[PDB]
Write an enzyme that holds these catalytic residues in place. Structure first.
Site, PDB file in Angstrom:
ATOM      1  N   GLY B  40       0.830  -1.190   0.000  1.00  0.00           N
ATOM      2  CA  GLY B  40       0.000   0.000   0.000  1.00  0.00           C
ATOM      3  C   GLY B  40       0.866   1.241   0.000  1.00  0.00           C
ATOM      4  N   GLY B  43      -2.662   4.867   1.429  1.00  0.00           N
ATOM      5  CA  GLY B  43      -3.634   4.204   2.285  1.00  0.00           C
ATOM      6  C   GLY B  43      -2.992   3.523   3.480  1.00  0.00           C
ATOM      7  N   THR B  46      -1.789   6.169   5.984  1.00  0.00           N
ATOM      8  CA  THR B  46      -2.894   6.785   6.712  1.00  0.00           C
ATOM      9  C   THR B  46      -3.540   5.804   7.681  1.00  0.00           C
ATOM     10  OG1 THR B  46      -3.283   8.092   4.711  1.00  0.00           O
ATOM     11  CG2 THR B  46      -4.930   8.227   6.456  1.00  0.00           C
ATOM     12  N   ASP B  68       9.115   3.541   5.577  1.00  0.00           N
ATOM     13  CA  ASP B  68       8.690   3.710   4.194  1.00  0.00           C
ATOM     14  C   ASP B  68       9.588   4.736   3.511  1.00  0.00           C
ATOM     15  OD1 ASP B  68       7.071   2.891   2.135  1.00  0.00           O
ATOM     16  OD2 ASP B  68       5.423   4.267   2.601  1.00  0.00           O
ATOM     17  N   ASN B 266      -8.847  -1.287   1.700  1.00  0.00           N
ATOM     18  CA  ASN B 266      -9.187   0.116   1.517  1.00  0.00           C
ATOM     19  C   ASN B 266      -9.402   0.417   0.035  1.00  0.00           C
ATOM     20  OD1 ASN B 266      -6.474  -0.331   1.027  1.00  0.00           O
ATOM     21  ND2 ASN B 266      -5.826   1.697   1.730  1.00  0.00           N
ATOM     22  N   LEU B 309     -11.877   7.284  -0.195  1.00  0.00           N
ATOM     23  CA  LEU B 309     -12.282   8.647   0.097  1.00  0.00           C
ATOM     24  C   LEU B 309     -12.234   9.493  -1.175  1.00  0.00           C
ATOM     25  CD1 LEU B 309     -10.639   9.420   3.559  1.00  0.00           C
ATOM     26  CD2 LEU B 309     -12.922   8.557   3.004  1.00  0.00           C
TER      27      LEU B 309
END
EC number: 3.6.4.-
Lengths: 66, 335
Positions: B40, B43, B46, B68, B266, B309
């Site tokens: 991911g 996403g 978050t 990351d 997600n 979203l």
């Protein structure tokens, strides 16, 4: 004519039957069946490999004696 | 041994699909290491931040370690960060940091001793697996001496996270190489110092550096294999490639005896009668197909669903929104 030989033969036969069944499964459409079957194959392969390494250690104990 | 099988007594309860929330994480007061990986990007980052925000309410102090390479954690919180952990705005307990992809241990946390260190690091360069693990170990030693109640990892979508989860094994195996490198650098250090600089003190250094970090490494190894203290959370989307890589990740976690029992799907689209969108309907058809496959295969996981979203939503608000949807399942858009 020993159990450790019979066990390997049965494990190899069952792993081969499982691999033959996995060739039928479509990975995209029926992923859950494919995954569960691949998990069983990997578990039985790891068991067979541990058994083979144990017998290989016994062979090394006899062939290259301590 | 003597007890009854206990399945004689009241037959067997029926399989209940687990709750699509991460509340099981919160109620696990024993968890001190929580990894958030899987393939991911924004996403995953978050999600890990929202998990930290919800964890801080019931805990004493929480950390955020982001290995990351992309610095999406600094982006999402609307605040920049660095190796030194800083408090997050509006929260007393939250602390967060961003470790480099090289782990920032290029400079370890007289000039002859500095040269000997540089020789050690340069010789260790020739073994990136062991050097990467040593940099993991230095980071874990700093965070352990920091003595926080629980840490959350926003890990990289690559295999280096798997290396991080097996860094004590890599160090234990690489001890021989480390001793070999030490045995080839020490006499040069000692010879150089004595023959030309009189002092011999520099040779005694780096001797006890590996005599106390190793017990910490062994404790962390015993701590990762413990499900009560360490768990992995997988982030993915409901597409075939993502499902395939997720299954591969879970299989390799089982190999390493690292526990996982929570999955996050997600970027889920939910068609709304208001503001129609045909490409969303097709994407929903594909997502529905593979999410049914997931709910069949991963019945032993908490499958938390998260909707895609709108693109406008950004920053702390989307974090706030996710922080709720991880504890209360999202409601369908049907008015």
């Amino acid at each position: 004519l020993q159990k450790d030989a019979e066990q390997e033969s049965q494990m190899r036969a069952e792993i081969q039957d499982m691999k033959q069944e996995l060739s039928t499964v479509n990975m995209m459409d029926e992923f859950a069946r494919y995954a569960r079957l691949e998990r069983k194959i990997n578990k039985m392969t790891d068991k067979l490999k541990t058994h083979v390494k144990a017998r290989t250690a016994q062979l090394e104990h006899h062939h290259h004696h301590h | 041994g003597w007890g009854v099988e206990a399945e004689e007594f009241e037959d067997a309860p029926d399989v209940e699909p687990l709750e699509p929330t991460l509340s099981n994480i919160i109620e696990q007061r024993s968890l001190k290491w929580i990894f958030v990986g899987g393939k991911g990007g924004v996403g995953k980052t978050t999600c890990s931040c929202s998990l930290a925000v919800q964890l801080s309410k019931g805990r004493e102090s929480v950390l955020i370690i982001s290995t990351d390479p992309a610095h999406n954690i600094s982006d999402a919180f609307d605040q920049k960060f660095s190796k030194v952990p800083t408090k997050v705005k509006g929260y007393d307990n939250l602390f967060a940091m961003e470790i480099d992809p090289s782990l920032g241990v290029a400079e370890l946390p007289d000039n002859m001793l500095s040269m000997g260190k540089k020789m050690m690091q340069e010789a260790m360069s020739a073994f990136p697996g062991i050097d990467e693990a040593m940099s993991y170990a230095e980071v874990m030693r700093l965070v352990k001496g920091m003595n926080f109640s629980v840490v959350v990892f926003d890990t990289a979508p690559t295999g280096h996270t798997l290396r991080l989860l097996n860094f004590p094994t890599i160090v234990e195996r690489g001890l021989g190489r480390l001793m070999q490198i030490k045995n080839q650098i020490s006499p040069f250090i000692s010879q150089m110092c004595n023959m030309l600089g009189l002092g011999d003190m520099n040779a005694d250094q780096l001797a006890s550096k590996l005599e106390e970090t190793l017990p910490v490494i062994r404790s962390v190894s015993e701590q990762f294999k413990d499900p009560e203290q360490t768990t992995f959370i997988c982030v993915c989307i409901a597409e075939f490639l993502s499902l395939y890589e997720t299954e591969r990740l879970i299989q390799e976690l089982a190999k390493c005896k690292i526990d996982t029992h929570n999955i996050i799907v997600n970027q889920l689209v939910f068609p709304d009668p208001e503001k129609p969108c045909k490409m969303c309907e097709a994407r929903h058809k594909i997502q529905a197909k593979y999410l049914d496959q997931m709910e069949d295969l991963y019945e032993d996981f908490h499958i938390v669903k998260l909707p895609l979203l709108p693109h406008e939503v950004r920053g702390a608000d989307k974090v706030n929104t996710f922080s709720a949807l991880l504890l209360e399942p999202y409601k369908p858009p049907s008015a």
